[PDB]
Structures are given as C-alpha cells and as structure tokens.
Amino acid sequence: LKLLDNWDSVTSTFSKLREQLGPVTQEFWDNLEKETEGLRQEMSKDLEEVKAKVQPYLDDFQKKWQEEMELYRQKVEPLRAELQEGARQKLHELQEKLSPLGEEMRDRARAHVDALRTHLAPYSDELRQRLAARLEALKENGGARLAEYHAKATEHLSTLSEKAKPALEDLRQGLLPVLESFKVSFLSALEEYTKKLN
Amino acid sequence: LKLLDNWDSVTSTFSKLREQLGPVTQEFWDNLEKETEGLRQEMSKDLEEVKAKVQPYLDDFQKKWQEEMELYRQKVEPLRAELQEGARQKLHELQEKLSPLGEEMRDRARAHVDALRTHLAPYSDELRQRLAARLEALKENGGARLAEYHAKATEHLSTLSEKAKPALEDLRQGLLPVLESFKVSFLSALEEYTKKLN
Numbered sequence A, B: 001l002k003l004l005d006n007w008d009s010v011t012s013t014f015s016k017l018r019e020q021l022g023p024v025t026q027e028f029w030d031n032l033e034k035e036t037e038g039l040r041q042e043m044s045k046d047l048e049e050v051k052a053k054v055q056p057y058l059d060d061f062q063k064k065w066q067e068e069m070e071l072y073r074q075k076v077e078p079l080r081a082e083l084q085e086g087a088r089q090k091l092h093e094l095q096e097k098l099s100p101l102g103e104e105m106r107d108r109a110r111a112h113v114d115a116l117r118t119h120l121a122p123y124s125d126e127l128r129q130r131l132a133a134r135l136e137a138l139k140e141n142g143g144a145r146l147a148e149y150h151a152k153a154t155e156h157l158s159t160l161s162e163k164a165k166p167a168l169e170d171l172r173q174g175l176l177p178v179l180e181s182f183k184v185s186f187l188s189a190l191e192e193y194t195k196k197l198n
C-alpha cells in the first residue's frame, strides 16, 4: 500500500547514484587518461625496444634453428638409413619367423580346430540329447505349471473379486460422505483464505 | 477408522495369500524337485560324461600343448640368438652415432646456451630497466589512483550513509507496519491451518 513511498526512497538513492556518476565519470576519465598516457609511455618504449629485441632474437633463433636443422640432416637423416637398415634386417628376421612359425601356428590352429571337430561337435551332439531331456522337464513341469498358473489365477481371481466387490462398495460408502465432509472443510477454507488474502 | 478398516481388508488378503502360498510352495517345489531330478539324472552325463571325455580332451590338448611349447623352445633359442646378435649390431651402430654425434650435439648445445646467455645478458639487464620504468610509472600513476580512489571511497561513503541512515531509517519505518500486518496474516494463517487441518 506504501509502494509509492518505498519506491521514492529507491528513486532518491538512484538519484544519489546519479549525483556520484557525474563527478565519478569526470574523475574516471581523468584517471583513464592518466592510465592510458602512463601505459602509453610504457608502450612506446616497449614497442620500440621490441623491434630491437624480437628481430635479433629471431636472428639468434634462426641461427639456432639452422644449426638444429643442419644437425638433424647430419643425424636424423643419416640415422634414418641406419634405422631403415636395422628395420629392414628386423623385417627380414621377422619374415624368417612369420613364415615357419606362421605355418606352424596355422598347423597348430588346424590341430586345435580339428580336435574341436571331434571335441565340441560330438559334445554339442551329446548336449542335444541332454537339452531334449531338460526341455522335456521344462515342458512337463511347465505344462503342469501352466495349469497351476491357470488354476491359481482363477482361484486368486475369485479371491480378488471377493475383495473388490465389498471393498469398492465400502470404499464408495465411505468416500461419498467423506467427500461431502471434505467439501465442507474445503469451502470453509477457500472462503476464509480468500478473505485473509483479500 | 478409515485406516483401520482399509487395513482390515488388506489383512484378510494376507490370510488368503498365505493360505494359497501353501499349495504354491507345494506345487512349485514338487515341480522343482522334478527339475532337479532331471538335472540329477543328467548329472550322470552332463558332469559324468564331461569328466570322462575330459580325459582324452585334455590329454590331446596337453600333448599338443607340450609340442607347442617344445617348438617354441626350439625356436626361442635361435630366435633369441638372432635377437641378441641383431640387437648387438643395432645398438652398437647407435653407439657409434651416440658418442661422437652426442659430443657434437653437446658442443653445439654449448653454443646454443652460450648464444642465449650472451643474448639474455643484455636482455635481462634491459628487462630490469623496463621493470623499473614500468614500476615507476605504475607507482606514480598508482599513487594518483590511490589518492583518487581514496577520495572516491570517501565521497562514496558519504552517499552510502544516505542508504545507511536516511534510506535505512525510511525502510525500517516502512517495515514496521509491514511486520504489523504480516503478524496478523501469520496469526490468522496459523488459525486457518489449525481450524481446517485439525
């Protein structure tokens, strides 16, 4: 109700901020000029010296890079041949290994898979008989269980309806009057609430 | 009484559930025993035949595995010798390109650092001069900034006091009736909740 009075105080403080902003921006600009000019003299000296520092530094670096690269062509380059030759010999050594051991490993695999043909295959065949027996039990007990499920389902169904019938009646017989009473407690609440917050 | 009555219906449900649970456990276990019975009979195959066949199965694999290892041992020796002799030459060659080329690299590194030091000497010298120049500027300007900021803070405090005394007093005065009305609202709300919830 006193919003206008409260907003006035805020308008006053806002105006107070404006009272400060005036001289504040004035001195801020003066300070900015001081800083910019201060950094300006530093920048001129920095930039000027940079030309006399980066250039000789680049030259120094270029010389080092030249030596570095030269040394690389006198090391990495010739060593590339030494390493390549070593790699070639290594590859040759590997060839003389990947061939006998390669065929040997393949023969090992042959002996492995071949064994599996007389190991896994005949075993899965035996398992087929066992699976048939297991599945038979699953079908036998399962079929019986299906009847049990149906029986218990119908039994439980009778029990469920035996509860649903009276429960719903009782629930309705209780919810109806309770709802009416609830409406009363709601009406009194809503009416009073709207008056308190009016 | 709603909770008691509603619970009563649930209680009777538990009775019927338990009464049905009996036949359930009986039937389930009866069939489960048949499942296990099958597995018990199957055990004379699934676990018995597997332990019987595991003999030639493992004996075959173990036999071939022995050869597999013996072959690897028959190769490990000549291959290790090839690797040893090869590594000898490969590493020896690297040494011939590690000692002289290393000393050369170290020699070039001497100049690498020497040139850098020779360049860093005047650089660091002028860096200290740059720092002095910058520090002096930042000190002159800094002192001015501090004085100005101090004055700024002083003025800000004067206007801040407008928010600490007049504005705050105004706010307090405005909050007084606010608390007064809020008290009534809280009190009535407390009663409202008690009147309808109790």
Ligand SMILES: CCCCCCCC/C=C\CCCCCCCC(=O)OC[C@H](COP(=O)(O)OCC[N+](C)(C)C)OC(=O)CCCCCCC/C=C\CCCCCCCC
Residues within 6 Å of the ligand: A053, A054, A057, B116, B120, B123
């Ligand atoms: C153009 C405009 C003007 C100029 C502008 C640029 C100015 C630049 C001037 C200076 C910049 C310096 C920057 C670095 C400052 C800190 C240097 C430092 O304090 O270093 C300390 C280390 C300490 O070693 P320690 O024996 O105490 O520890 C031994 C530990 N334990 C037991 C393994 C082996 O000593 C070292 O780093 C040095 C020895 C190790 C060197 C490793 C390889 C470096 C690679 C190339 C050489 C680079 C030379 C330039 C500096 C490169 C830095 C990466």
Ligand SMILES: CCCCCCCC/C=C\CCCCCCCC(=O)OC[C@H](COP(=O)(O)OCC[N+](C)(C)C)OC(=O)CCCCCCC/C=C\CCCCCCCC
Residues within 6 Å of the ligand: A061, A064, A065, A068
């Ligand atoms: C003209 C100027 C030429 C400048 C040439 C500079 C290089 C010169 C060549 C060699 C000498 C300088 C080497 C400088 C770099 C290595 C510096 C170094 O001394 O490092 C040592 C650390 C040791 O660690 P630590 O765990 O043993 O001990 C600490 C951890 N603690 C606690 C658990 C033990 O590290 C190690 O020793 C492991 C090092 C593994 C190998 C690193 C090789 C780096 C070389 C090049 C990398 C370039 C990357 C470029 C990326 C951008 C591409 C565009």
Ligand SMILES: CCCCCCCC/C=C\CCCCCCCC(=O)OC[C@H](COP(=O)(O)OCC[N+](C)(C)C)OC(=O)CCCCCCC/C=C\CCCCCCCC
Residues within 6 Å of the ligand: none
């Ligand atoms: C001791 C206390 C223990 C706890 C007791 C808890 C008692 C709870 C009592 C009552 C249940 C209250 C919650 C009921 C929720 C709704 C149930 C229902 O009535 O939802 C029917 C719809 C029928 O389809 P509609 O297209 O008309 O969708 C209608 C929905 N609308 C809009 C979005 C398309 O359902 C659907 O829509 C989607 C599903 C359709 C049927 C899927 C059947 C799946 C097959 C087998 C699942 C068997 C689960 C058995 C769980 C145990 C049971 C004993």
Ligand SMILES: CCCCCCCC/C=C\CCCCCCCC(=O)OC[C@H](COP(=O)(O)OCC[N+](C)(C)C)OC(=O)CCCCCCC/C=C\CCCCCCCC
Residues within 6 Å of the ligand: B014, B017
């Ligand atoms: C409309 C129809 C909706 C569907 C209705 C379904 C009704 C049937 C299903 C569930 C009804 C459960 C009724 C439970 C009544 C109370 C039983 C009870 O005695 O409450 C208390 C007990 C003990 O206290 P506590 O253990 O809770 O805490 C102990 C805390 N401390 C250790 C401090 C000791 O609670 C216990 O005994 C823990 C009992 C846990 C029982 C879990 C369920 C078991 C049933 C089947 C499991 C799967 C079997 C088949 C698996 C096939 C695999 C292939």
Ligand SMILES: CCCCCCCC/C=C\CCCCCCCC(=O)OC[C@H](COP(=O)(O)OCC[N+](C)(C)C)OC(=O)CCCCCCC/C=C\CCCCCCCC
Residues within 6 Å of the ligand: none
């Ligand atoms: C649900 C979301 C996650 C699903 C994860 C699994 C996904 C894949 C499906 C099934 C895998 C289940 C893996 C876990 C199985 C249960 C493990 C377990 O921790 O169980 C514990 C219970 C309780 O005793 P405990 O050992 O914990 O505590 C006393 C002993 N202590 C000291 C050492 C603790 O064990 C018992 O209650 C008694 C157990 C008796 C077992 C007899 C087995 C006889 C052999 C064959 C029978 C027929 C099997 C047919 C195939 C069945 C496939 C499931």
Ligand SMILES: CCCCCCCC/C=C\CCCCCCCC(=O)OC[C@H](COP(=O)(O)OCC[N+](C)(C)C)OC(=O)CCCCCCC/C=C\CCCCCCCC
Residues within 6 Å of the ligand: B046, B047, B050
């Ligand atoms: C119905 C007929 C069926 C017939 C079936 C036939 C095939 C059956 C299949 C397997 C049977 C295996 C039987 C093994 C019997 C020996 C077990 C054993 O004694 O073995 C001991 C070792 C070492 O034991 P130690 O060092 O303590 O003693 C060492 C003592 N000394 C030094 C003398 C070295 O241990 C081991 O062999 C354990 C090796 C396995 C370790 C698994 C660890 C898993 C851990 C976490 C689970 C991660 C799951 C990840 C899933 C996603 C993956 C991508």
Ligand SMILES: CCCCCCCC/C=C\CCCCCCCC(=O)OC[C@H](COP(=O)(O)OCC[N+](C)(C)C)OC(=O)CCCCCCC/C=C\CCCCCCCC
Residues within 6 Å of the ligand: B138
């Ligand atoms: C308005 C903002 C600008 C003006 C700020 C003026 C006040 C500055 C100081 C504090 C500001 C207030 C908050 C606190 C700041 C940290 C103060 C401090 O006490 O920190 C100390 C640390 C550690 O000291 P310690 O362990 O070595 O010595 C310990 C004693 N004893 C050596 C015996 C080893 O200091 C260190 O860690 C060394 C590294 C410090 C951070 C360097 C990088 C800063 C990043 C940007 C600034 C760039 C400025 C460029 C020039 C602008 C000119 C206008």
Ligand SMILES: CCCCCCCC/C=C\CCCCCCCC(=O)OC[C@H](COP(=O)(O)OCC[N+](C)(C)C)OC(=O)CCCCCCC/C=C\CCCCCCCC
Residues within 6 Å of the ligand: B153
């Ligand atoms: C922040 C800008 C304000 C601008 C207006 C005022 C300007 C005033 C004039 C100049 C500025 C001066 C700034 C000074 C900063 C000092 C920072 C600092 O180093 O302080 C350190 C103290 C440490 O602890 P201690 O000395 O108390 O105890 C110590 C107990 N022993 C010693 C055991 C160690 O801690 C403290 O000073 C606590 C400092 C708490 C500062 C709260 C500022 C709240 C301002 C606005 C709120 C909203 C911010 C986000 C706005 C987002 C907008 C988009």
Ligand SMILES: CCCCCCCC/C=C\CCCCCCCC(=O)OC[C@H](COP(=O)(O)OC[C@H](N)C(=O)O)OC(=O)CCCCCCC/C=C\CCCCCCCC
Residues within 6 Å of the ligand: A065, A068, A069
């Ligand atoms: C971003 C980070 C990348 C990290 C990569 C790490 C692995 C690097 C692998 C090998 C080494 C580098 C091998 C680089 C080979 C480069 C070969 C090359 O032609 O690259 C062309 C690209 C071109 O980029 P652009 O985007 O500008 O143009 C693309 C073009 N329009 C198109 O897509 O058709 O530019 C580049 O790729 C960059 C070329 C830089 C050449 C430098 C040549 C330098 C010559 C000698 C060495 C001097 C060393 C000096 C320092 C010594 C130590 C101090």
Ligand SMILES: CCCCCCCC/C=C\CCCCCCCC(=O)OC[C@H](COP(=O)(O)OC[C@H](N)C(=O)O)OC(=O)CCCCCCC/C=C\CCCCCCCC
Residues within 6 Å of the ligand: A190, A193, A194, A197, A198
């Ligand atoms: C009779 C009451 C008795 C006491 C009751 C006490 C309990 C009351 C509690 C609940 C009852 C009311 C329950 C109301 C449930 C409303 C549920 C609902 O509609 O959700 C959706 C609405 C949608 O609003 P809108 O469409 O404006 O905004 C949509 C939004 N932009 C978007 O698109 O995302 O979301 C919104 O409206 C939220 C923003 C609203 C902005 C306007 C908000 C306007 C708010 C007030 C209007 C001015 C009041 C001035 C003072 C009056 C008293 C002096």
Ligand SMILES: CCCCCCCC/C=C\CCCCCCCC(=O)OC[C@H](COP(=O)(O)OC[C@H](N)C(=O)O)OC(=O)CCCCCCC/C=C\CCCCCCCC
Residues within 6 Å of the ligand: B171
């Ligand atoms: C549209 C504009 C509307 C403007 C409305 C303005 C209304 C103004 C109303 C009244 C004027 C202000 C009236 C202020 C009254 C309180 C003034 C005051 O500071 O009293 C001193 C106390 C001091 O607490 P201490 O914790 O230091 O005490 C000792 C401590 N308990 C111990 O035992 O160690 O601090 C306090 O009591 C208060 C909390 C201090 C910490 C706050 C810590 C910070 C907490 C909140 C502030 C930040 C909130 C950030 C929210 C971000 C949302 C995204």
